[PDB]
């Protein structure tokens, strides 16, 4: 079978403009394991990004956590972009500090 990914974006701490935080993109529920995940700042790829080693759930579906330090500002837009064999194009999920 195959499974499309779920994508959840969230900061570690409440956002405070100009204060250092961690931006997280949790990608889960997908199969097969090959996947491409970028964090974006104003539409451009962030270079420094950390991720977990691959793991999977009880139903055999995979999951990964991508994360980077960042400083939220008022202007700057952040997002997670995922590509997977099950998607007819890349999925982009924006960070929204109020969700």
């Amino acid at each position: 079978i195959q499974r499309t990914p779920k994508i959840q974006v969230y900061s570690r701490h409440p956002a405070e403009n100009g204060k250092s935080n961690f931006l997280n993109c949790y990608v889960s529920g997908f199969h097969p394991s090959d996947i491409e995940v970028d964090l974006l700042k104003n539409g451009e790829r962030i270079e420094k990004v950390e991720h977990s080693d691959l793991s999977f759930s009880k139903d055999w579906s995979f999951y990964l956590l991508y994360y980077t330090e960042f400083t939220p500002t008022e202007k700057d837009e952040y997002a997670c972009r995922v590509n997977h064999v099950t998607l007819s194009q890349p999925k982009i999920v924006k960070w929204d500090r109020d969700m």
Binding site: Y10, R12, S33, E50, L54, F56, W60, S61, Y67, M99
Partner: protein
């Protein structure tokens, strides 16, 4: 006691074509990674200073040898038998094996395998049992594995003798980290409108350990049954994140509070007011 009560290793082996297999592997206590695996050399990466538990450096090197030889050997054999088993590329195999401590002191061991993201086999009382979703392929596989010298006896010893020793030893070795209590922070926001004259009240709870947590919206002592909990999501530092949302009328927010209870906060419940 609190924190994890099980240890397991996983395997993900991805077969692109006859030339190209890749295997990814790791060791876990529940949800917390404690071993990595460097695929190319076939060696373990110990992620915590107590990840060897109470095992000797010699027994650990011997276990890494077992897993190295299993991983390359398995990948080679799969590639060599893919024609016979009518496999189409690409395909992906997964495995999980380990043991778990039950409330009465009983330790139960398990091993399961997958193909195509579906159950393929399991080990039940020392034998290979094919799963229904694996079909005639899984039957063939379990009829074949018993022909290999030492495989089934090694799997037996690792599951039922080695794993329970390792698990009690590492839960004891890592107990200062594993049973630590870490208090969350919490905060409120107004989420995307769920509709005209409605507000989405969001209560965020982040940085708790261990994982079990309780979060509810309230009007004084009254639980709001409309509370929706999100997924518990990981942070990178061995803590978790969760939101609880309540869809409320635009004039009904006042008097509402988010209440958080956690093992680290006994006598210290967090209560946050919207207005």
């Amino acid at each position: 006691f609190q924190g994890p009560t099980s240890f397991h290793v996983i395997q993900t082996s991805s077969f692109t074509n006859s030339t190209w297999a890749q295997t990814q592997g790791s060791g876990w206590l529940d949800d917390l990674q404690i071993h990595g695996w460097d695929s190319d050399s076939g060696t373990a990466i110990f992620l915590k200073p107590w990840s060897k538990g109470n095992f000797s450096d010699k027994e650990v090197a011997e276990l890494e040898e077992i897993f190295r030889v299993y991983i390359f050997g398995f990948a080679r054999e799969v590639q060599d038998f893919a024609g016979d088993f009518q496999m189409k590329y690409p395909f992906e195999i997964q495995g999980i094996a380990g043991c778990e401590l039950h409330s009465g002191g009983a330790i139960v061991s398990f091993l399961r395998g997958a193909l195509g993201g579906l159950d393929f086999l399991s080990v039940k009382n020392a034998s290979c049992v094919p799963s229904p979703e694996g079909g005639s392929r899984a039957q063939k596989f379990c009829a074949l594995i018993i022909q290999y010298q030492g495989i089934m006896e090694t799997v037996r010893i690792l599951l039922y003798e080695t794993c329970p020793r390792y698990l009690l030893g590492v839960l004891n070795a890592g107990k200062a980290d594993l049973q630590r209590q870490v208090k969350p922070e919490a905060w409120l926001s107004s989420g995307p409108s769920p509709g005209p004259g409605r507000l989405q009240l969001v209560c965020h709870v982040s940085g708790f350990y261990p994982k079990p947590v309780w979060v509810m919206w309230m009007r004084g002592e009254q639980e709001q049954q409309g509370t929706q909990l999100g997924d518990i999501l990981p942070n990178a530092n061995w803590t978790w994140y969760l939101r609880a949302t309540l869809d409320v009328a635009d004039g009904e927010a006042a008097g509402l509070s988010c209440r958080v209870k956690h093992s680290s906060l006994e006598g210290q419940d967090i209560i946050l007011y919207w207005r």
